């Protein structure tokens, strides 16, 4: 319906500029007829999820690259795609004028946008907050008499979550994660630094902390929000590290095992929220498979654990086969889920690089590699940040797919936004990854899935500068002949019956 | 009553530690006979408003600096001293347990504390808020039917103000200032940035903004709070600067002149709040005397303007005689009032330096300089902040005289608090500044005033590291022999008959 | 000869992109014939020192703005324009390929560029260095036996200075300034922080420090470089400030007075370098006129002081009339010279803003205001920086007129470069400022000067968004009719005989 | 000989203070009889390589962990230990007075110190340089007629290396690595950034770059220095990354394979320096085993490659078995060597933490892990840095075992220095790692080796805070009863007959 308004900030590609009265958008979903395929294309040159349609051919000759669907090779089913409603994201969004707020929310959660169906919600403060607080800061309030949601929840996060759900056609799942407990539950008496829960699993400190989870879910349910899942702790390894700068709460794998078995599992199970799923780890994949082995080899913990949540940040230190792959082999019935991802990275680079094509490619490359190693969902980090990558009370600025410019009542949709959308818009919940085999060595990343209705979706990212002629074979329909431009990302869709 | 509990955090002096059950405090005042003086002393070495007495004698033993009272030289009368009940200050105070809250409020407002009699109240959000909002964010509501106070006012600010007034030694005057209007009244449609009211004075946008002042005063009057004064805009010059990040609303001096003459003046005068005073500028003294000349040489604006409000960034240097002095010389019948002061952080220092004696001296030096240049009152910025100088949704740059540590139910009284108190506790409303003659060049800052009852008060700040032998002469009583220790601050009081 | 290659980085205007094989450049100077005028125009829209010529008219009618030359009102003569060859600047320049280095140096120092004729040279390290060092770091080497120039001088600064002088058609003057002494000469034993020379003027510490100046000049003269001037210390007030973060050496005005009278003056005068000029202050103008009064009222110091050097950084705190104007009135025969200027400023803004028109306007506005208040020369700060504003060992990053992109063998000429050039290219040494009177209130900054040969030059900066029709009257030639576009800067030249 | 002079800077342990006249040192080694062991102990509490002796007894009194020597299990032989003579290290050493310089050099290279026998020498500039340069910056000199060594080599590095060799206990091996080629040989024409050699292996650019290695070895041989080895490129992968800020030269594994096979191998083999070894990779272990597979499965490249050089960023985590282990398994006849290690700063810590015990333990843990995965030598990065971690022309991120304070003619020996020394002093070239069996799970890191003369050496690092009772068994001698204090590091040595 409305095209990208491009703006260069001097980097490799353009952002799409939105404001109170204008934002690029899609037309309502259309579907290609049998014998035809749909193609969505984004390019560093500036194309943004442009739609085209081609014929499926009966024959193919040539020595060119062929990607053959293996529809009977069936793997994981997808839970969904989304991002995090941090204090920083909600503050930035609500600082825009109301019409601009609605265009930003529709960009993410509408079928006119990219169809997010997951929102991750911090349990009280994290580094992407402007102040440190928990829900129960009265010292030694073991009964949690003074547990309460502050305005960050009641005036920022919760109203935006309601509005996202109203705009979404797809059912949206909420995921919650805590960063720190109240300081009076901690060995170090501080929100950050090295420190764990006082005492030992089963004791008053651990029972109070497990009840804090239930109190959080109770409070959100009073605001008519229900959670699909919670994680046991954001980045439990961080609170094992001297001087760790952000809110944290350290657990060894054994401490997490015993906390889940004795306290969190049973307390959640005996609550009205017993159907909320519990995810373990919520940390860098290099902690796998060991963390999964420690927790899940104890049946009194394993019975409460639905899944394993991973973060992308340190992916470069550990191969995905040795971490995700081996974890799946050991525990095939325990889903893997990517609970946090982000790019404000290289030290010679700014936290926010408006128009960076490379950071978009980093997202799509990680999503494809995750899908090939059994991951069922992805939540990005901050849904929106300001041009500095904030606010953040420790100045740990990073990038975000949408950058808000409050002084101009403007927001910018980054290449990351469209790279994410090439998956989130076209891979609904229940889609199952299937096999896809290449005829020759190539510089492409590709993944195939089948929708619940049987239709096919393939995403292709060209990591190279070179255009790559390519054919996709579906023995059900025929041959899809196409070209992957260098530094492009394509999503292909076609019916099989 | 109760002495300071000192604690050092590695800076040049100590803070005084208060909690739910303990805070340093004063006994009720006690007036010694003619021939005796009272001294209150605070020192970098750790003395905190410690009381002593001594004689005023007929013979002069000193041979050093003489300061002679000249009570027949009469200058301005004092309106008072206080600070700002920002969202941040209120949030921090209310994070303490109720007994701790009351000790903090008594510290500022009680005769057990330092006797503040001014509170400055932001009209809706500013940078020391946890979110952006105005009282009328629903757009295109020019009659302001949907004007309303949010929880920041009805739950945080107004109850705290009521409690301060209940505790107050003296009648407290309230002062209101707006940061931004609803953004649908602004040229840039944003809460911050370079932007003014749309249109021109007299038109629907300016009439609506003047009505917004009346709606605000109406709302607070429904909660049984009456204002002594309002400023025309906080920092009007800031909204003329591209990219200005805090909530703002830009006015040139000519725009403010015409807004006052056509819209704000008449509208307030035609309301039940016609007795509320209106102060102009509310900005850095650098803008004087020009801003005063522009506004006050127009009789249709001048008739509505009671005074000129000035801000102080206490870290910088500027020219008081050239700004405050020359403004008084040109407009001697228009009071000068300091509506905001704070000690920023030089870029190499933290926002909050617990125990900084230097930041305390910057306060007392500023107050003395102001009193010597005809200023009638002095209002601090945030009454309380957390240890990071927040919450602030944009950036933490300033300190506060009271720092709250929520996680320990404690608050710290900084040297700034006592340097303020050496004036606020001992200079009631209606006190008059009078002459004080130094007999020779010296390193002290000093000012003399007369209480309404005719008794004397002299404040002496020693900027230098050296003890200074000092004599103070009252022609009516005799000679007060004393010593001003290096870095110290003293308040002397004595009956004159 | 070669036009600007424009590139936007998303700010208000464009940079001009240069590399090893291309840089925008001028044709050799041309001169308009009597009855005609030359106009150079730069605009936010992207014009860069574009040349045009018009007729001088005999008559003029209208109520429009008229600027009338007052050629017999004669003021100061100009020394020149340039910038600082810091370690950071030289490192950045020499990291480019050799052909690119030459295009960058010609941009500044050639008649194909903007004709710089001053270079300021730090005496050893400052904040725009990658390491702290002095020329004499052996402790207690009062004889300066181990005084030596490091590679920063011999391999970076000195070779670039030689090459700039070779490219310059105009004679270039060098100005030197120290930041710190060796630490063993200082009360605090550190390169930064609060600290002055040990002892008292006339003693061994002060004699050694004065001899260090002579040793520096000796060493540079062995490399065939001679200095026009030295300053007594960069920013002497900075070393009076607790925690000052960069290299510094504190002097009160009295200490500087006595150091010059007893040590620096006589030591320089008795050296082979006795013709080098000595400038005092080299600090913010707010220290004037007091600093000038203290130093120059002592005839034993005044006899050695040629001039007063000022920095722009804190100009906003003190009016130029009260500082520069009053200093000129008191000491009319002691030249005023702007020894440092820079813009990496507002806290909500990046250190480097590629293409910022506003920062260019800030330069031209300051140069005009300086010229109107008797200043004879201007040296910008760093001649070139990287895109972060560095390197700088304390991360005190700021902007620069040329930004080097080493990875791309590219450099960017900022709007500041062209705003500077509108003065430096067209105001040779010996030009005398003359009177220029406006017919009506206007939003223009303008300054007129006469070249040694009698020709006229006028620079006009339009601070407003609005085009301003304008006439300039020279009773010698006639009327120059023109328009100043909004946000433009023009230089006009015409012969008078 | 002389003990440590401890000084604390607020971190977890002390540094040892050395100056012109004092540095801690060792007596000449002394070998006790069969049945006696020597222990050298360093502790967080402040012991520094303190020597004690005790008995190896026939009876075992301990009941805790047993470590049993298995001398018939023989693994790799050790080449040695050392560090890098960067421009920065040389500048820092030469800033000391000559007597202090000699104590620093003896600390590293003397039997009075820790017996280093490897020095890594950059071929021209890197980030730890004060300027950019290569040996052939004059462009288009393909025969390299203008190749020459600058003062960094002839004045700083080469004289220091000669002095180190004069002092050295043992024959010292020199190892050379280039960061960038002359930029006129590079695709991007810049010293850093994403860029490789122009053209393809075998052509004039690659032939010239291989000749550059021979010219470098020629030049150093003229100064009577011979190299044991050279690496093909420092960090070849870094030059494949857009924006990489340090000097670099990018090679894919295939490009390195073909460069070695066609140009560098043959050229070195045809020179008088044919005996110099060539090491491949010189990069992070993450690139293994892939990089090794690509290069070493090509026989025309493999015949020139003596070993694989690896880097360690000691702050991160990675997988040694998956990289070093698997590379040894696949290429068991190709030695592994650690060519660079350093402890970066987590973003919340300073580059240099004077006295950090943790950074010391990171060194000894890395060395033990390497020795257990077949690595034959371990080379630190900068031998010395200043207190800010410089000089570095790009950024300061890493610590160094010796920190020089020029302004006090002193240098500080960090815990890193002694943790290194527990290996370097006691493991001469030709020592062989042998088996050591732990009797039960434990928290110690330990490794055993045999000197060429057959005596034993065992290093034991206690990562935990708890004292660990320990027994060490030599089947040939008996039982050594000891205790490993929490955090400590011990080296044990004993004769076996
Ligand atoms: O030395 C004086 N001041 C002073 C100096 C140093 C320090 Cl530490 C403290 C005080 C002083 C000097 C002359 C007259 C008076 S005065 O008492 O007659 N006051 C005045 C008289 C005429 C105009 C203005 C005033 C006014 O007080 O502003 C006071
Ligand atoms: O417990 C052992 N190690 C150890 C554990 C903990 C600590 Cl703290 C220190 C040492 C060990 C176990 C089995 C065999 C051997 S071995 O001595 O026979 N060595 C080997 C035998 C076969 C293959 C490889 C090796 C090799 O040493 O790498 C050593």
Tell me which ligands are bound.
Answer: the ligand O=C(Nc1ccc(Cl)cc1)c1cccc(S(=O)(=O)Nc2ccccc2C(=O)O)c1
Task: Please outline the major beta sheet of chain A.
Answer: 9 strands, mixed, barrel
The proportion of strand residues of chain A reads 25-35%
The total beta strand count of chain A reads 21
**What class do helices, strands and sheet pairing of chain A give?**
alpha/beta
Oligomer: homotetramer
CATH fold node name of the largest domain in chain A:
TIM Barrel
Q: Could you say which overall geometry of chain A the principal axes of the C-alpha atoms support?
A: globular
Kindly provide the name of the CATH class of the largest domain in chain A. Alpha Beta
Helix content of chain A: 10-25%
Q: Which chain pair has the greatest contact?
A: A-B, 29 and 31 residues
PDB class: hydrolase
Keywords: Activator, lysosome, glycolipid metabolism, hydrolase
Assembly: tetrameric
Entry title: Crystal structure of glucocerebrosidase in complex with allosteric activator
């Amino acid at each position: 319906a409305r095209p990208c308004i491009p703006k260069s900030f001097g980097y490799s590609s353009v952002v799409c500029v939105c404001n109170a009265t204008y934002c690029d958008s899609f037309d309502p979903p259309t579907f290609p007829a049998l014998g035809t395929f749909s193609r969505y294309e984004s390019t560093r040159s500036g194309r943004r999820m442009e739609l085209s349609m081609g014929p499926i051919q009966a024959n193919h000759t040539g020595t060119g690259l062929l990607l053959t669907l293996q529809p009977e090779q069936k793997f994981q089913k997808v839970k969904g795609f989304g991002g995090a409603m941090t204090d920083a994201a909600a503050l930035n969004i609500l600082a825009l004028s109301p019409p601009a707020q609605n265009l930003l929310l529709k960009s993410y959660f509408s079928e006119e946008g990219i169809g997010y169906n997951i929102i991750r919600v911090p349990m009280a403060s994290c580094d992407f907050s402007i102040r440190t607080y928990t829900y129960a800061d009265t010292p030694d309030d073991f009964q949690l008499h003074n547990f309460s949601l502050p305005e960050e929840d009641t005036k920022l996060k919760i109203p935006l979550i309601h509005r996202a759900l109203q705009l979404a056609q797809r059912p949206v799942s909420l995921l919650a994660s805590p960063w720190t407990s109240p300081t009076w539950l901690k060995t170090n008496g501080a929100v950050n630094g090295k420190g764990s829960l006082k005492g030992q699993p089963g004791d008053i400190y651990h029972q109070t902390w497990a009840r804090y989870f239930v109190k959080f879910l109770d409070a959100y349910a009073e605001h008519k929000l229900q959670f699909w899942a919670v994680t046991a702790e954001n980045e439990p390894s961080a609170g094992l590290l001297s001087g760790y700068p952000f809110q944290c709460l350290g657990f060894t794998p054994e401490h997490q095992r015993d906390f889940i078995a004795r306290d969190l599992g049973p307390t959640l199970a005996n609550s009205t929220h017993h159907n909320v799923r519990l995810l373990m780890l919520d940390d860098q994949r290099l902690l796998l498979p060991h963390w999964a082995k420690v927790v899940l080899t104890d049946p009194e913990a394993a019975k409460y654990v639905h899944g394993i949540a991973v973060h992308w940040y340190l992916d470069f230190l550990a191969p995905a086969k040795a971490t995700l792959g081996e974890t799946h082999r050991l525990f095939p019935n325990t889903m893997l889920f990517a609970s946090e991802a982000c790019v404000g990275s290289k030290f010679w680079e700014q936290s926010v690089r408006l128009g960076s094509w490379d950071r978009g490619m980093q997202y799509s490359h990680s999503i494809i590699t995750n899908l090939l190693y059994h991951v069922v969902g992805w939540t990005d980090w901050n849904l929106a940040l300001n041009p500095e990558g904030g606010p953040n009370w420790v100045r740990n600025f990073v990038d975000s797919p949408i950058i808000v410019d409050i002084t101009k009542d403007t927001f910018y949709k980054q290449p990351m936004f469209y790279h994410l959308g090439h998956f989130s818009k076209f891979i609904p919940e229940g889609s199952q990854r299937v096999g896809l085999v290449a005829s020759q060595k190539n510089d492409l990343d590709a993944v195939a899935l089948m929708h619940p209705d049987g239709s096919a979706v393939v995403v292709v990212l060209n990591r190279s500068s070179k255009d790559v002629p390519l054919t996709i074979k579906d023995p059900a329909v025929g041959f899809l002949e196409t070209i992957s431009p260098g530094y492009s990302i394509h999503t292909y869709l076609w019916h099989r019956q």
